[PDB]
Paper text:
The first step of adenoviral replication involves the interaction of the fibre protein and more precisely the globular trimeric knob with an attachment receptor from the host cell. Desmoglein 2 ([name]), a newly identified adenovirus receptor has been reported to be used by some species B human adenoviruses including HAd3, HAd7, HAd11 and HAd14 for cell infection. Here, we report the structure of HAd3 fibre knob (HAd3K) in complex with one and two molecules of the [name] receptor.
We recently demonstrated that HAd3K binds to [name] by a non-classical mechanism involving mainly one receptor bound per trimeric fibre knob. The interaction with [name] ectodomains (EC2 and EC3) takes place at the top of the trimeric HAd3K close to the three-fold axis. The EC2-EC3 domains span two HAd3K monomers, with the third monomer having no contacts with the receptor in the 1:1 complex. Each EC domain interacts with one monomer and targets primarily loop regions of HAd3K. Several residues distributed along the EC2 primary sequence were found to interact with the HAd3K monomer, while only one region in EC3 (covering residues 311 to 321) is involved in the interaction with the groove of a second monomer. In the 1:1 HAd3K-DSG structure only a single monomer of HAd3K binds either the EC2 or EC3 domains. N186, V189 and S190 are at the interface between HAd3K and the EC2 module while L296, D261 or F265 are part of the HAd3K/EC3 module interface. Modeling of HAd3K binding to one [name] molecule in such an organized structure precludes the binding of a second [name] molecule coming either in cis or in trans without significant rearrangement of the desmosomal cadherins.
Residue numbers in the entry:
A (entry chain D): 108 to 135, 146 to 194, 206 to 224, 228 to 291, 297 to 331
B (entry chain A): 130 to 218, 225 to 239, 245 to 318
C (entry chain C): 130 to 219, 225 to 239, 245 to 318
D (entry chain B): 130 to 219, 225 to 241, 245 to 318
The structure:
Amino acid sequence: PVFTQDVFVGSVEELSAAHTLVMKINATKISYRIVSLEPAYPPVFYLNKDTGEIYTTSVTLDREEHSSYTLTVEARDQAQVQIRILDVNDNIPVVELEGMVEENQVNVEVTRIKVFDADEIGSDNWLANFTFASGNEGGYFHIETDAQTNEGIVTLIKEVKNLDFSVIVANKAAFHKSIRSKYKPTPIPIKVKVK
Amino acid sequence: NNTLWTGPKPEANCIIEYGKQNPDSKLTLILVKNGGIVNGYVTLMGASDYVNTLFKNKNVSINVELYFDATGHILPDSSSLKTDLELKYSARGFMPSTTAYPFVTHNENYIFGQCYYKASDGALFPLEVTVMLNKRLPDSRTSYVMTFLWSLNAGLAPETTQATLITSPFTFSYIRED
Amino acid sequence: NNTLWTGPKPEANCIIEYGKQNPDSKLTLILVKNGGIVNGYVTLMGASDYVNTLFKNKNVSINVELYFDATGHILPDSSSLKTDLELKYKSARGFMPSTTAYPFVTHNENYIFGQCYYKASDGALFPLEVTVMLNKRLPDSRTSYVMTFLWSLNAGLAPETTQATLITSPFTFSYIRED
Amino acid sequence: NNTLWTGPKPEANCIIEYGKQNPDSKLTLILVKNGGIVNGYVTLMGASDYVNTLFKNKNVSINVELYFDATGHILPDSSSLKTDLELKYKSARGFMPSTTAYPFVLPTHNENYIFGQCYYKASDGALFPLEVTVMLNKRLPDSRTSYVMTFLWSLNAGLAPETTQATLITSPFTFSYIRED
């Protein structure tokens, strides 16, 4: 029959376990039934037809493949359900180099380390946290993630030869429990050029 | 009397389509008494369209749960199997150990491993097997819990057409309860 | 009695090279009966020059086939093992792979996969992908059970540069026995 | 009599951190006399602080040495498992690894290694894979032992599996070897 609301808003996390509860729809016997899905090539969700609890199924979700879903349910003796997928950090950052500095110039930018993550743009799961591997023993370069364009800015602190170094890329948040223990730090080297 | 059969080539006795009343997939479960431990043998064959079109996706987790009682027979209304296990010629000796795999993190109740799924063209895509013993009581008449999980992740799908889901045989060992 | 030895430390009885008639490798195969299934043990050891220079390459294949008969004895004129499997203390049909669970012909329910490790002479460790294929095929009309093996390798760098004795780690499997 | 226990869930009996009196880690070892082979079972569990802080690093290696004698008992003087193994329904030569297939050498020898893998579930659920190297006899340490069976859980990861302290529990590893008659 007629529902108690107009548009159901729910959420579910990416790469969750099977038969995880997404949301619970209700109405004023009552037979809940999904009659349409707008993305329909996997059956990703499962509506419990007796009580109306949307469960996930044996094929798990993917935010990076499809950002959100929309399915219209029907109660027999209709309403939209908009399910937005919560992003987790299941994607390792990769780096797609030279630098030219002058003699004894303080706080001059060197170059921009480009980095291309594939998670949600603007969170901690896409912002690349740059650390050091070898080359900042004497305290020379400070590193920074520019949050608008995702670039590893390097800039002189103690001004000053081919003093090369290497960075290690990671995200600002922790990696997901299916992708951690597969990540290995690859030291990406950078040659500087003084004059 | 030291083998719990399902049959070497059985009919359909498991349900993976969550919300379907008939059995639609076959699994062979053979548990033999070997001294103080019990050797394991499990594989899963699909017998419907929904199970055979599971592996057109990249991330698929298949779940099978078994809920034995205190005697040793499968409760056929809550577990994922629909036909209880039979001997070769009660069945408390094949059940897992209560004092070694106890009820409540508790990472001591787990047995991990690996099997393989050979595709329709042949690529040897590996599946990660997670066998979880007791750890959880669903009601007041269940007393022993066994739970399998075949978790696959891949960069691309194993097939683009429906053929047949057949996993490789998996071997495990757990402490039994006398 | 519930054991089919080859031996605890066997002599050269298995051939590898397509064209040779002399045995040039040792195959330690132990099958024991355990209830309704049969466990396993396999370890190939090199005993020539050609098996020892196999691992100079980066992609190899070591094919070992065992064509049984209707009683349980290895036919030595068509298999790759020139020595019959003899028991421990004292009809060996109860050790064979079953023809009901592993039938004759598709049919990917006959394979048993796994992994053993080759330890190189310089200290490194290399994994080998074992493929054990049960019946699936009849090479003749006298054969009634087939049990083959394959030790594949696909590594980037070569494991050895010179001749070293090829020993693989033990591999353990299980299958359903014929009643 | 075909089971060699250590207990289904024992107390702290093993010793890691060389140069220590009291035991600091549990160890479950079940050897079953199955025909012509022995079906094994091994599982570590931490019972102190030093074994629990092991996975703060990424390149660690846990080593357990067992030194049997000619009648088939663990010498509690120079081994690591400071507890004699029992039976299920209490000689124990029939579970020991055979010197025909795995013999001693004295100068290389690589035919008495059993390589395998177990897994470590971390504090957040990430499975870290450990390498197990079971080494049968190969090396007589002194003049009293007769059989040597050592284990080695090794880890070489890219990140630390822990930062705080948690119970180091490893997965049940199942091996097989040829037994002494």
